[PDB]
Amino acid sequence: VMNRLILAMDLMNRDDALRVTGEVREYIDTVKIGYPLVLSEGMDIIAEFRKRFGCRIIADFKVADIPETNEKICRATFKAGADAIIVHGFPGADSVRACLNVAEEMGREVFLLTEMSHPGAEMFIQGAADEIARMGVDLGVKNYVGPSTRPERLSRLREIIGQDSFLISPGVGAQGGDPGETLRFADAIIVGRSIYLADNPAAAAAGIIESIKDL
Amino acid sequence: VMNRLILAMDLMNRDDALRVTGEVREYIDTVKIGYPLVLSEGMDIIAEFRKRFGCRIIADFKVADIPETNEKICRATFKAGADAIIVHGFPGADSVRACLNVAEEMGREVFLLTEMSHPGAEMFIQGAADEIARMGVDLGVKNYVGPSTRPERLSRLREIIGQDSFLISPGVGAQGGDPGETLRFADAIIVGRSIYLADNPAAAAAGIIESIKDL
Ligand SMILES: *c1cc(=O)[nH]c(=O)n1[C@@H]1O[C@H](COP(=O)(O)O)[C@@H](O)[C@H]1O
Ligand SMILES: *c1cc(=O)[nH]c(=O)n1[C@@H]1O[C@H](COP(=O)(O)O)[C@@H](O)[C@H]1O
Numbered sequence: 277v278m279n280r281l282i283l284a285m286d287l288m289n290r291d292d293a294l295r296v297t298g299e300v301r302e303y304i305d306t307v308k309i310g311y312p313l314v315l316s317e318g319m320d321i322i323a324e325f326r327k328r329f330g331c332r333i334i335a336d337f338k339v340a341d342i343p344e345t346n347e348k349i350c351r352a353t354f355k356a357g358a359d360a361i362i363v364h365g366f367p368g369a370d371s372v373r374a375c376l377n378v379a380e381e382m383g384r385e386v387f388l389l390t391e392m393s394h395p396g397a398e399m400f401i402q403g404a405a406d407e408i409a410r411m412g413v414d415l416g417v418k419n420y421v422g423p424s425t426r427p428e429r430l431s432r433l434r435e436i437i438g439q440d441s442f443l444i445s446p447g448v449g450a451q452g453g454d455p456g457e458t459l460r461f462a463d464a465i466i467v468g469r470s471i472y473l474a475d476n477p478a479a480a481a482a483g484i485i486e487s488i489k490d491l
Numbered sequence: 492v493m494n495r496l497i498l499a500m501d502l503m504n505r506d507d508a509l510r511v512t513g514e515v516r517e518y519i520d521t522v523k524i525g526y527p528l529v530l531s532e533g534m535d536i537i538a539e540f541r542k543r544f545g546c547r548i549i550a551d552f553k554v555a556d557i558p559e560t561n562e563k564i565c566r567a568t569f570k571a572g573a574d575a576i577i578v579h580g581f582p583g584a585d586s587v588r589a590c591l592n593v594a595e596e597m598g599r600e601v602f603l604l605t606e607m608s609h610p611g612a613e614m615f616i617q618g619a620a621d622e623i624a625r626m627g628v629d630l631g632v633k634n635y636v637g638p639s640t641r642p643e644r645l646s647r648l649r650e651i652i653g654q655d656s657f658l659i660s661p662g663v664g665a666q667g668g669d670p671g672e673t674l675r676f677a678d679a680i681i682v683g684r685s686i687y688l689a690d691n692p693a694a695a696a697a698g699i700i701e702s703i704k705d706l
Binding site: 286316337338341345348352366367368372392393397398399404407411451 | 666
């Protein structure tokens, strides 16, 4: 990813989302779009962004349903133009395999979310996260998501998935995570609020990048 | 709910979804709409359904994000007219509380999904489900979702949440669950494919009700 930085575009109205993404485009090549924006402006916003910015789009839908419904969600998401979709591994292997089958059919990618970055992740997800990561490896998953807020857990996740797997990580900035430390284990960092709520989003992105390039 | 039956309307195009829902309307008073229909036709479909059928609408979005994003998803969903939203409990208590706070602000309801109905639920969710249900009780959750495919687990969930809590249950029909046995513990059953893929959806719904009324 350009500059190893992925923008989490979670503003909820089209005009502000387009403005901020355009302001930081020279510093990124990948935008993560989720439900806050899609449920407010429609799935057509994915194709609009992909075209307008010529960026790769990751649909962060944290898919967490039964196999049959996960297939339908993945199919609609790829039909809308997304390059990849983020899927929860907590619901099990069949649910993840349903997503992988659709990505294979459509020439796209699945990112497996192992451990989440917020405090509540410690209650149930953290204890199952190493096993969720191993399950991903056993299913042939090559793209993963792990927590910036717990670099020791990000390290253990990297250990399980190997150096060849691609690992992205949210929780940088607003949630407390550090760009440099996170990039010791992740290939790219996801940043949302630290950039999109900034008085000058481009300056915020530029500052993050400067603290990175020094790695 | 009318006849203790909730329709899971997971068809992906508006015309077929409207046709089937209209054909079975005399047998239900609540429609569960999820991402297969919303991501294909837009969030406006919720208000259209609520108005056209005068039914209560549960948005089955299996919300599974961090607190801040969960708040945004719930706000967009209630703004769209949904009466309730289904939320995963596995991300932890703060993620669930974020949904409860928005529901309180907007005069709506949250349903907490404890254990899922598909096979993969046995891998990680089942082992945490009793605790997820207890967490719900501690947070003051009054509406829950549990699996028709495992009535012994549905019984244990009912035991934890008490008789005053409202419990709905998917996995009836296509996934193997039985209407009557599930209703021994759940207040209402959720049915999707057994009705919407039937040659005559009204006859399928009527047949299910026949079993129910006999209880
Ligand atoms: C998903 C999973 C996870 O573990 N942590 C997260 O924060 N997310 C999503 O990533 C974005 C973080 O953005 P920000 O905290 O930098 O504003 C956001 O889209 C969240 O839903
Ligand atoms: C959600 C959670 C769960 O544990 N099980 C489920 O099946 N779901 C959703 O409920 C519907 C079941 O429909 P059907 O199997 O009768 O067709 C569906 O919307 C699924 O996503």
